[PDB]
Amino acid sequence: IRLLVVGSSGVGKTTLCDCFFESHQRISISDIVGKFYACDNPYDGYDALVMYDITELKSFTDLKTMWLPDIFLYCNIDTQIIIIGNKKDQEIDRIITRKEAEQFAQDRLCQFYEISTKDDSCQLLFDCISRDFLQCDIKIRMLMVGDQNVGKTTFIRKALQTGHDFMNAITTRFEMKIKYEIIMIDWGFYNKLLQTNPAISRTIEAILIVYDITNEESFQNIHRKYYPLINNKFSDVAGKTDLEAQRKITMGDALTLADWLGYKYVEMSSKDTEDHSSIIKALAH
Numbered sequence: 001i002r003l004l005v006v007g008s009s010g011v012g013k014t015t016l017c018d019c020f021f022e023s024h025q026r027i028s029i030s031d032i033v034g035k036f037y038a039c040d041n042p043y044d045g046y047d048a049l050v051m052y053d054i055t056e057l058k059s060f061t062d063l064k065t066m067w068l069p070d071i072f073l074y075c076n077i078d079t080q081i082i083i084i085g086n087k088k089d090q091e092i093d094r095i096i097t098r099k100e101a102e103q104f105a106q107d108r109l110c111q112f113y114e115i116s117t118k119d120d121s122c123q124l125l126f127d128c129i130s131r132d133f134l135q136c137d138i139k140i141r142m143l144m145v146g147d148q149n150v151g152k153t154t155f156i157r158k159a160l161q162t163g164h165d166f167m168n169a170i171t172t173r174f175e176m177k178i179k180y181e182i183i184m185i186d187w188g189f190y191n192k193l194l195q196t197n198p199a200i201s202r203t204i205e206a207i208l209i210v211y212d213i214t215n216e217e218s219f220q221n222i223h224r225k226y227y228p229l230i231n232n233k234f235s236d237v238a239g240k241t242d243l244e245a246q247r248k249i250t251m252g253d254a255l256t257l258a259d260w261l262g263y264k265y266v267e268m269s270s271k272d273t274e275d276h277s278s279i280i281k282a283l284a285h
């Protein structure tokens with residue numbers, strides 16, 4: 001219900017929530033523009049919207065440059081980022097393609113919608129996010145080791161992904177009755193994120209690393225020893241193995257678990273929701 005609108009000047013918020021005449025006053029709302037040291041506190045009190053012109057290429061290029069680092073850096077693990085093409089009633093005037101705008105919307109882990117401030121659009125978009133507020137609280141971003149074999153098998157419990165021929169970005173929301181949302185990521189998409197936004201692990205809480213029989217886990221750990229050391233952790237077994245003594249030597253850093261195939265009906269549901277639940281309870285204030 002607490003929102004902030006950013007973006008350069010050819011178009012924007014003024015006209016945008018000028019149509020919030022419709023949505024304003026059940027379900028509540030508040031909207032402010034970003035630009036006192038105490039009044040800089042409600043700045044970060046958002047639940048989330050950086051826009052750009054489809055006509056002005058410069059607005060988009062400055063969404064990719066001028067706007068984003070602030071929004072990524074200061075925002076707490078909470079909220080979420082929505083990227084909005086305005087106009088679209090101007091669609092003849094689009095100099096800015098939808099698929100790479102949405103692709104660079106995907107690669108930053110942001111939601112993306114092209115609207116028209118004039119009519120339609122608007123209230124629809126608003127409606128959507130309103131729903132995703134009572135559909136779920138917000139998201140927890142978890143990462144899962146992306147080595148070749150076992151990942152897909154672990155992820156089958158999402159909706160199977162092929163999709164993302166390079167980097168996964170998977171969604172699962174289940175709980176009990178606060179109904180929260182958990183997003184699984186893969187090791188491929190993390191280093192692919194770091195060229196876009198370095199240290200997005202500020203948004204990452206749980207760390208899952210899977211395994212079958214032979215793996216050192218050294219490299220992946222020590223390269224993940226940087227942005228983490230807050231986190232949360234589990235090592236998993238998948239598939240001369242299933243010996244738990246040499247599991248807990250690397251797991252001396254973490255907690256570990258062992259299972260296989262579709263016996264995971266519990267293990268999945270056991271492991272995830274375990275650490276997940278702690279994310280709610282363990283650190284809160």
Ligand SMILES: Nc1nc2c(ncn2[C@@H]2O[C@H](COP(=O)(O)OP(=O)(O)OP(=O)(O)O)[C@@H](O)[C@H]2O)c(=O)[nH]1
Nearest residue numbers: 008009010011012013014015086087090116117118
């Ligand atoms: N064609 C078209 N123009 C729009 C739309 N929404 C806003 N505008 C135009 O945007 C122009 C000025 O931008 P503003 O609406 O004031 O956006 P802002 O949030 O105040 O940000 P600034 O650009 O700094 O003023 C106005 O002339 C509006 O007509 C839209 O959906 N379609």
